[PDB]
Design a binder for these strands. Structure first.
Ligand code: B4P
Ligand code: G2P
Ligand code: MG
Ligand code: MG
Ligand code: MG
Ligand code: ZN
Lengths: 79, 40, 1091, 158, 71, 93, 210, 105
DNA sequence: CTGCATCCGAGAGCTGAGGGAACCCAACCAT
DNA sequence: ATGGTTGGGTATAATGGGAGTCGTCTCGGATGCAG
């Protein structure tokens, strides 16, 4: 299928971003009828909830990196 | 912006939207022009 | 200084009074000085004569009205926050048809605001201007069918809110149909109601073919007119019981009731001229002898059929034609609101007549005047067309009074209007300025009246033309509308003349806006002046013909924002309109009659006229305008001086010897300078600051109130706890700062204590403000003329003055659209200087010229150089003024002075000048083989001089354009804009920082700022912005505590706005629940909302 | 580097180019008085003639700058890319050219004056139509582009 | 008050209204009565021409402690 | 530009990982009062005021300098966080 | 009417006015609704605004910040630094001293200069059309009321000097400062993200001179 | 405090709405015209929505902390933080059922 | 019985700044 | 024990309302037309 940007954006899985975009009453009533769960995949939902966006320094690829010197690492190695 | 392979974690969707939208403001005149881009 | 003027065009008539569009309109609406027996049927008199008699029996009939004198003068109204108004009394009589008794009484109806001499109003102590509105004229129009070509739609349009628009259209099946109130139905039914037979219609519309066949319907005709009336009523009001008298009343009110339907005088005139018939009144039909009589419908249908049949002499209408658009001025809008109030008063009267005891009733007891006062107050306080008057300088007020708006109540919408209404129509020529308009989203919707234009009694703009007879231009001047203008061939005003005979074989002319070339015999009218094409603001730009229209727009708009200066000068190059502008703004003072001056003071001028009467004119001194600028009048006359009629007595703000003085004439060089004039920036010399150039005076008002509270009254006093005597030095014994004290941010202006046993609630100077306290005003309960709000015991106001010098970040502009912010202030020894030691004052970057194509500033600079060395000023009218050869001759004389001075003292040509002359010889600016003086003169005749660098002493490698330029300081001051906040007040609901510098607010981090933060991948910065700095209450408290304790800020939490969103979604009966990874509820409200 | 009025050099060829045009126009009128041309054909021929005259004037202006004043301020500004494009320079020096009515159709007479020579009142009013149309174009375009950008952000944000 | 204004040809003062009510009425009591008769205004009253500014946008919260106060 | 920014960008596979490492090292330096630094006493970042040169208070500059020296180890799942912090506290109270 | 006013029939209005009452649906939706006005965008603390002036003597990574603006923006840091020094006995005394303009001395400016050492601020010009509309700069304290901007970032900001104003924001924590210094530094953003061509490049007078 | 990972939206039953509410709003009164205090059973009642002042009941018997969760016998106001006035809901019991317009229009 | 075809109604149109109308009478809870 | 507040009562006859708005564009249900 091929649909314009408006209809593609309003048809997403996340009801928070679609509700904050446009046609709020329709999106909200459909999501409430369906009991939709928003999994917070995109950026708009995390911004709305005031969370750390899954991009840049908030990406799971890099945000669990640790840093340590050589002296502290050796002490833990002896332990 | 760095002339090197993109880093993992880059929000390329936002970058794409801004890249398309910036010139359209004022640069693209107004079937032809901005209406053509919007129609497409 | 001698003034020399160019130009060949002689103007037969002077400019009309520039504020007449307001003054004449309101005078005609009020008719205050016309005795009641000779008052016309316009204005509020028409409203009175229409609403009355209030028939019920009892009859209340209007006889006449009068207007009293204002209870308080203008300055008292300004000081006490009152409205400058006059009482309105109407004398009425109650008669009893059955009995006969007549009770006559004069009833007080309320107050009507009065326009001042300058053309503004004083509403609640504030100066206001009513903006004229442009809209579609009422009448009959015919337009092409958009859906299907070859068909036409007829429209009947009454005055706004005075009836429904009526559409007539030939349906594709052949039957004609009339649409009213969104109800399609066949017009033949209503035609039968009006009393038309088959033979009459057939003979009136037989010629035009099959349209009359498609009109025919035997079912409708067979019914008697009354039956047709009932049937039409049941089509128009489905469900409503079809009583005869009910249907009669409804249909009468639809098209035939003068109190409900009203084609205006303009609409009547336009219908009569379009249809070639005679109206009896202002309605589409008349109700006479229990029978409807037609007035407009059949002529409209005839014209429509003839147009559809292609009969010659029938054309469609251009709805943007200025003959089809009209202007509602202040008087008409006020009269419309007055009519609405009068209708509500009539309703109240009728109700009281029904319920009241008819035996003991008088006009006073029947009439409740509250609705009329409410309507007038609403119009003058909440109408979008009633605007806070712009009085930065007198030109600002003059411009504001001549403004025309397409927006407003009943007007167009800025988001839905597109291209059609915003375009410059051909008929705008001489009526609406094509240049002056806002640049943003309001472009083309707000415009200005042309300089010579006049709004006629019907609301149509007229422009003047000279009559030409047999190739001879006469002195007869005819003011014409666009429709009348369309019937002639009009020659341009710059047509060559010998005496008053057209001395040109080929004449450029306009025919219905189309340029044409005609012989002198074919000429019927000629333009009066180029000045008539543009507005007053655009008429003040010299060399306007050398400027692109966009930059002329910028210059015209930017002359309104010029700030009055304490050493303001008139421009070196003027257009010849500055004196009329100064005179017509009523800012300066002029001698009423021939006489002699007796007493002169900084606040008073007493003049002894030849009548022997002494007249004393007080002077307005250091008065705060609506925009904070100080407007004062300074005497320009001496004791014993002889003054003729109209001679200047005192200069107003931004005036120099009666000439408009919005800025300063400065020496400028056009050259780059170390990147400090990069991209519109401006470099200025410290010598400007040394001699108080571009120094302005500004006044700010700080207001406080002591009111009544449940815990005890507030009190303004000096006794304030918990402050040392260093903070209470300047307060007097009454708790108010003393006059003349200097105040800085944090200092107390008025002391106040509130019952907390009391606590400090004093008024202090906000950050970034302060100055010298110049005035204090105290208003207490009971004082004459004071009307405080209930509960407030007293109010104290303090006026504080500032003397602002030019600084980095201030905005300067010339009249050609060149604007820029001061970026660097250099000492005198660093500025480029002439070989005689004179430094320049301003350096402008040449890169601003080529793409803006405003060449008028360059010619202004050349003429300014010539005038600077010749010591004279110039008047150069637009499109007829100084040309290049004249400027070159003046520059030759100026060079003779500028160089003979040096040669007399015993100096030759400098070595640096020789090097520059060599460079210019290579550049091709001078001809090889001439002496150094001849090449220097050639450069001077090109407007260029050898310039030396103040930092090194070496000359600029090429000759540089140098000359005098008129530059104004703009109201955009960095002092009033710089603002910063760490923490402060928060909003009630969202718990987010407030907005605005006045509220000590924070900057808004909007959607695209968030988008940029996301595109950078700066997740932690964005999370900080969205929680720790806006609405995470615990988060922001902890962050501040950690920062002041030296630690790092903690992790953020859920923002309060999301909790507000959850609660508002619950109020809509929607269950929003936050879940963890195992789909179990997570309580974000910390157990404070769970039972 | 500075800008004077004489720095907007008017080429001599322009005068010739104008007379040549004033020649052919007469011819066109003849061809319309003898039935050989329709209204549409004559209108298009006049428009084409004036367009080619404008192009010739542009070429003459820049040839004069290249041959005689290679260090001219406007020429240097345009060639270095600092400020200005050839059309604006032609408007400053050669002639403004043809203008569009509010209906979108061209006028029959062009503006034969440059900004250095100074326009007449009628020519200024005629150009005001295009100036106003460009301003209104900008005003609507900015809003339409903002709305489009918001839609794109909403569709690609994830 | 409306009858007094009709008679006087101008807005009456509070003392005149107090005199016209009868015994047991002074200007202060009239002031209190006018004070308690004031009807609240809407937090959603539009300020300015554009549909972007409401009255409640200009009202600060005075209940919750500020970050400085909490510290 | 920041000194050695090209080297820092070349030391990691993703620039956001470099940002995360720098921020975490700055937090570590701030928490222990710059006593856990890997810089020699003559590589310490200095700041010039009227009284004289003192230590640079900006921990992010210290973190970038330390990353430049190459004496810091960074990666995924190097040491448990609790044990890491306890050991750091043991060496530097 | 309570749930969605102005949807079926004539909207409910308050007497004496034509203004429709604002229902919950009106609160939720629109440009002024909760989502677009308070959730996807907020007003923030530690921010300011001022007119911009050309900064030709600045380096690529530097911006000129007014002294008063900087004092207001970094106020808690300045209070802590004043506590560390002998300027004030306690934070409350430092705040009271900083409250009145005429009560400020000389050493507080040196303390402020020590406070901002190495830190960066965010400059932003509306409208923000691309990410380059926000950039990080090291502040140099200047006199006056105007922000000084480097000439080479004007094209990225679409900024000129005919009255333009810009907003200033302060990243607070170590993570925010690291992100601003590494990712959003002006000297680190030299090529266009849209085309890959240089975006900070000579223009106007620089091209003319060369 | 568990991390939030998903947000769900669904229809609310009358039982759910009644479990949300801390009491039924029975009167249209907002505040008293003399004392500017909330009216009992009104739209601002402290018995339903919570106290205006922190740790202080309506009648002033208790004005101190440690009484969290304790309801004053005379006035019926719980002793807790006043911030609960922006979280605690009420409800109106309709005499007849009404349709939610979102699902109609 | 299907299909397409106008027809109606519903939801949109950049950011930032600044902008403010009856009267009377008697019992009864609250303070 | 006082004022403030609240419930009840008035008897010729009365019997269906009233303001308003016509200068915007695009897209998805739906009733109407034909085959
Ligand atoms: N009801 C009514 N009746 C009559 N007239 C009415 C009216 N409503 C509106 N108007 C008209 O609206 C205009 C009011 O002026 P405004 O445009 O409101 O403001 P200004 O005083 O000109 O200041 P500004 O700072 O915008 O100036 P400039 O463009 O030089 O500033 C340059 C810089 O400012 C910034 N800027 C300007 N406009 C911007 C915008 N829209 N968005 C963002 N930034 C903007 C940019 O950084 C830019 O580079 C008048 O022409 C007036 O006639
Ligand atoms: N978001 C908006 N910004 C605007 C609007 N109007 C003006 N502006 C801003 O103000 C700027 C005004 O630009 P100017 O007209 O001065 C022209 P610019 O500097 O772009 O070009 P040159 O004249 O070629 O030097 C514009 O670029 C925007 O940054 C508007 O309606 N919306
Ligand atoms: Mg503007
Ligand atoms: Mg610019
Ligand atoms: Mg600008
Ligand atoms: Zn209690």
């Amino acid at each position: 299928l091929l649909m314009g940007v408006t209809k593609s954006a309003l048809s997403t899985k996340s009801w928070l971003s679609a509700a904050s975009f446009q046609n709020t009453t329709h999106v909200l009533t459909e999501a409430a009828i369906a009991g939709k769960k928003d999994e917070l995949i995109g950026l708009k939902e995390n911004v709305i909830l005031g969370r750390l966006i899954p991009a840049g320094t908030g990406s799971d690829f890099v945000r669990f990196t640790q840093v340590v010197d050589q002296k502290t690492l050796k002490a833990i190695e002896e332990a | 912006s760095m002339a090197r392979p993109v880093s993992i974690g880059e929000a390329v969707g936002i970058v794409a939207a801004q890249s398309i939208g910036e010139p359209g403001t004022q640069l693209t005149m107004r079937t032809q022009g901005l209406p053509r881009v919007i129609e497409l | 200084m001698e003034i020399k003027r160019f130009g060949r065009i002689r103007e037969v008539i002077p400019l009309p009074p520039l504020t007449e569009i307001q003054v004449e309109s309101y005078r005609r609406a009020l008719q205050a000085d016309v005795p009641p027996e000779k008052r016309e049927n316009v204005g509020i008199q028409a409203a009175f004569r229409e609403t009355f008699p209030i028939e019920e029996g009892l009859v209340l009939d209007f006889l006449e009205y009068r207007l009293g004198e204002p209870p308080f003068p203008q300055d008292e109204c300004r000081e006490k926050d009152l409205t400058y108004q006059a009482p309105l009394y109407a004398r009425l009589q109650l008669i009893h048809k059955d009995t006969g008794l007549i009770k006559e009484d004069e009833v007080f109806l309320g107050h009507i605001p009065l326009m001042t001499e300058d053309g503004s109003f004083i509403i609640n102590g504030a100066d206001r201007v009513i903006v004229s509105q442009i809209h579609r004229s009422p009448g009959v129009y015919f337009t092409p069918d958009p859906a299907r070509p070859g068909r036409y739609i007829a429209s009947i349009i009454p005055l706004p809110k005075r009836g429904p628009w009526i559409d007539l259209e030939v349906e594709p099946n052949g039957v004609v149909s009339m649409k009213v109130n969104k109800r399609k139905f066949p017009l033949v039914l209503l035609l039968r109601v009006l009393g038309y037979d088959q033979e009459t219609l057939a003979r009136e519309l037989g010629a035009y073919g099959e349209l009359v066949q498609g009109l025919m319907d035997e079912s409708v005709f067979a019914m008697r007119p009354e039956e047709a009336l009932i049937r039409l009523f049941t089509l128009l009001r489905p469900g409503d019981p079809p009583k005869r008298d009910k249907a009669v009343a409804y249909v009468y009110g639809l098209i035939a009731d003068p109190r409900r339907y009203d084609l205006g005088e303009a609409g009547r005139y336009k219908a009569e001229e379009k249809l070639g018939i005679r109206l009896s009144g202002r309605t589409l039909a008349r109700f006479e002898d229990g029978e409807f009589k037609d007035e407009v419908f059949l002529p409209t249908l005839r014209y429509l059929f003839a147009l559809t049949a292609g009969v010659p002499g029938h054309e469609v209408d251009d709805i943007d034609h200025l003959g089809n658009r009209r202007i509602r001025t202040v008087g008409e809008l006020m009269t419309d609101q007055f009519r609405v109030g009068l209708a509500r008063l009539a309703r109240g009267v009728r109700e009281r007549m029904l319920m009241g005891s008819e035996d003991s009733l008088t006009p006073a007891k029947l009439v409740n005047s509250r609705p009329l006062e409410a309507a007038i107050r609403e119009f003058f306080s909440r109408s979008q067309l009633s605007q806070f008057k712009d009085e930065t300088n007198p030109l600002s007020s003059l411009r504001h009074k001549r403004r025309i708006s397409a927006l407003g109540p009943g007007g167009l919408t800025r988001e839905r209007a597109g291209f059609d209404v915003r375009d410059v129509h051909r008929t705008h020529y001489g009526r609406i300025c094509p240049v002056e308009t806002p640049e943003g989203a309001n472009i083309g919707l707000i415009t200005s009246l042309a300089a010579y234009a006049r709004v006629d009694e019907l609301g149509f703009i007229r422009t003047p033309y000279r009559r030409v007879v047999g190739g001879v231009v006469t002195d007869e001047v005819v003011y014409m509308t666009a429709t009348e203008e369309d019937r002639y061939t009009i020659a341009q005003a710059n047509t060559p003349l010998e005496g008053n005979r057209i001395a040109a074989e080929r004449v450029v002319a306009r025919r219905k806006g189309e340029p044409v070339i005609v012989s002198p015999e074919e000429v019927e009218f000629m333009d009066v002046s180029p000045k008539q094409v543009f507005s007053v603001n655009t008429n003040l730009i010299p060399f306007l013909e050398h400027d692109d229209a966009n930059r002329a727009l910028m210059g015209s708009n930017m002359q309104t924002q010029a700030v009055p200066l304490i050493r303001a000068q008139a421009p070196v190059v003027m257009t010849g309109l500055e004196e009329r502008v100064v005179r017509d703004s009523l800012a300066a003072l002029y001698a009423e009659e021939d006489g002699e001056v007796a007493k002169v003071d900084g606040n008073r001028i007493v003049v002894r006229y030849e009548d022997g009467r002494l007249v004393e004119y007080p002077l307005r001194r250091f008065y705060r305008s609506n925009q904070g600028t100080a407007l004062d009048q300074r005497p320009r006359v001496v004791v014993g001086q002889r003054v003729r009629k109209g001679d200047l007595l005192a200069d107003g703000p931004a005036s120099e010897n009666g000439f408009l003085a919005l800025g300063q004439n400065v020496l400028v060089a056009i050259m780059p300078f170390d990147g400090y004039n990069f991209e519109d920036a401006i470099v200025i010399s410290e010598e400007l600051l040394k001699r108080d150039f571009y120094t302005s005076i500004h006044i700010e008002r700080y207001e406080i109130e002591a009111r009544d509270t449940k815990l005890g009254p507030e009190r303004i006093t000096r006794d304030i706890p918990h402050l040392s005597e260093a903070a209470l030095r300047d307060l007097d014994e009454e708790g108010v700062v003393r006059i003349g004290a200097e105040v800085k941010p944090g200092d107390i202006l008025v002391g106040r204590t509130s019952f907390k046993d009391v606590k400090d609630t004093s008024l202090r100077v906000p950050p970034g403000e302060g100055g010298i306290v110049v005035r204090t005003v105290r208003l207490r309960r009971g004082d004459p003329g004071v009307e405080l709000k209930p509960g407030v015991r007293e109010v104290v106001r303090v006026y504080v003055a500032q003397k602002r010098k030019l600084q980095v970040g201030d905005k300067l502009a010339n009249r050609h659209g060149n604007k820029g912010v001061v970026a660097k202030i250099l000492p005198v020894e660093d500025m480029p200087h002439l070989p005689d030691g004179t430094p320049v004052d301003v350096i402008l970057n040449p890169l601003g010229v080529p793409s803006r194509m405003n060449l008028g500033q360059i010619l202004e600079t050349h003429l300014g150089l010539a005038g600077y060395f010749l010591g004279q000023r110039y008047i150069s009218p637009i499109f007829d003024g100084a040309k290049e050869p004249e400027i070159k001759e003046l520059l030759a004389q100026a060079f003779e002075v500028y160089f003979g001075k040096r040669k007399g003292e015993g100096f030759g040509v400098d070595k640096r000048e020789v090097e520059v002359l060599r460079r210019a010889e290579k550049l091709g600016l001078v001809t090889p083989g001439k002496t150094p003086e001849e090449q220097l003169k050639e450069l001077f005749l090109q407007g260029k001089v050898v310039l030396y660098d103040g930092r090194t002493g070496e000359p600029i490698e090429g000759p540089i354009v140098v000359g005098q330029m008129f530059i104004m300081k703009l109201y955009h001051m960095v002092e009033d804009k710089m603002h910063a906040r760490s923490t402060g007040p928060y909003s009630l609901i969202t718990q987010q920082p407030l907005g605005g510098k006045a509220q000590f607010g924070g900057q808004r981090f909007g959607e695209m700022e968030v988008w940029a933060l996301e595109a950078y991948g700066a997740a932690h910065t964005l999370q900080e912005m969205l929680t720790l700095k806006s609405d995470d209450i615990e988060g922001r408290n902890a962050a501040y505590e950690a920062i002041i304790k030296g630690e790092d800020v903690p992790e953020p939490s859920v923002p309060e706005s999301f909790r507000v969103l959850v609660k508002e979604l619950q109020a809509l009966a929607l269950d929003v629940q936050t879940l963890d990874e195992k789909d179990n509820p997570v309580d974000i409200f910390e157990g404070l909302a769970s039972k | 580097i500075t800008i004077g009025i004489d720095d907007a050099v008017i080429p001599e060829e322009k005068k010739q180019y104008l007379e040549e045009a004033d020649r052919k126009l007469l011819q066109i009128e003849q061809a319309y008085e003898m039935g050989f041309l329709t209204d549409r054909e004559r209108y298009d021929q006049i428009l084409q003639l004036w367009t080619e005259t404008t192009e010739k004037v542009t070429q003459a202006v820049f040839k004069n700058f290249e041959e005689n004043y290679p260090f001219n301020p406007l020429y240097v500004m345009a060639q270095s890319g600092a400020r200005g494009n050839p059309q604006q320079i032609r408007q400053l020096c050669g002639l403004r050219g043809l203008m569009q009515k509010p209906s979108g159709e061209t006028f029959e007479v062009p503006v034969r004056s440059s900004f250095r020579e100074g326009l007449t009142v009628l020519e200024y009013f005629i150009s005001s139509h295009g100036a106003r149309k460009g301003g209104a174009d900008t005003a609507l375009r900015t809003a339409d582009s903002g709305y489009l950008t918001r839609k794109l952000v909403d569709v690609t944000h994830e | 008050a409306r009858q007094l204004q009709q008679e006087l040809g101008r807005e009456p003062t509070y003392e005149e209204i107090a005199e016209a009510m009868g015994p047991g009425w002074d200007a202060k009591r009239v002031e209190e009565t006018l004070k308690i008769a004031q009807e609240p205004v809407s937090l959603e009253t539009p300020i300015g021409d554009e549909k972007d500014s409401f009255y409640g946008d200009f009202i600060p919260d005075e209940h919750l402690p500020s970050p400085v106060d909490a510290a | 530009a920041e000194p050695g920014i090209d080297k820092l960008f070349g030391m990691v596979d993703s620039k956001y990982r470099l940002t995360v490492v720098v921020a975490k090292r700055a937090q570590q330096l701030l928490r222990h009062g710059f006593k856990n630094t890997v810089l020699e006493p003559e590589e310490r970042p200095k700041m010039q005021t009227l009284e004289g040169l003192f230590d640079d208070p900006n921990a992010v500059t210290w973190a970038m300098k330390e990353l430049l020296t190459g004496r810091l180890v960074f990666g995924e799942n190097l040491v448990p966080e609790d044990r890491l912090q306890k050991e750091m506290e043991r060496l530097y109270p | 009417a309570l749930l969605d006013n102005g949807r079926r029939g004539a909207p409910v209005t308050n007497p004496g006015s034509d203004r429709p009452l604002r229902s919950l649906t009106d609160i939720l939706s629109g440009k002024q609704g909760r989502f677009r006005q308070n959730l996807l965008g907020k007003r923030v603390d530690y921010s300011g605004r001022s007119v911009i002036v050309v900064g030709p003597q600045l380096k690529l990574h530097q911006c000129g910040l007014p002294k008063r603006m900087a004092l207001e923006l970094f106020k808690p840091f300045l209070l802590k630094k004043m506590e560390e020094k002998g300027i004030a006995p306690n934070v409350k005394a430092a705040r009271r001293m900083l409250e009145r303009q005429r009560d400020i001395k000389d050493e507080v400016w040196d303390a402020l200069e020590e406070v901002i050492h190495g830190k960066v601020v965010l400059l932003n010009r509306a409208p923000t059309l691309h990410r380059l509309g926000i950039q990080a700069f090291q502040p140099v304290l200047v006199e006056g009321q105007s922000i000084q901007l480097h000439p080479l970032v004007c094209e990225a900001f679409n900024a000129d000097f005919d009255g333009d104003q810009m907003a200033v924001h302060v990243p607070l924590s170590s993570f925010a400062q690291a992100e601003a210094r590494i990712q959003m530094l002006s000297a680190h953003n030299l090529l266009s993200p849209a085309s890959g061509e240089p975006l900070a490049k000579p223009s106007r007078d620089i091209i003319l001179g060369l | 405090k568990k991390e939030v990972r998903k947000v769900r939206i669904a229809l609310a039953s009358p039982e759910k709405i009644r479990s949300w509410s801390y009491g039924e709003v029975e009167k249209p009164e907002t505040i008293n015209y003399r004392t500017l205090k909330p009216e009992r059973d009104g739209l601002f009642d402290e018995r339903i929505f919570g106290p205006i002042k922190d740790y202080e009941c309506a009648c002033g018997k208790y004005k101190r902390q440690r009484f969290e969760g304790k309801v004053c016998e005379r006035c019926g106001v719980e002793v807790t933080k006043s911030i609960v006035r922006r979280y605690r809901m009420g409800h109106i019991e309709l005499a007849t059922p009404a349709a939610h317009i979102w699902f109609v229009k």
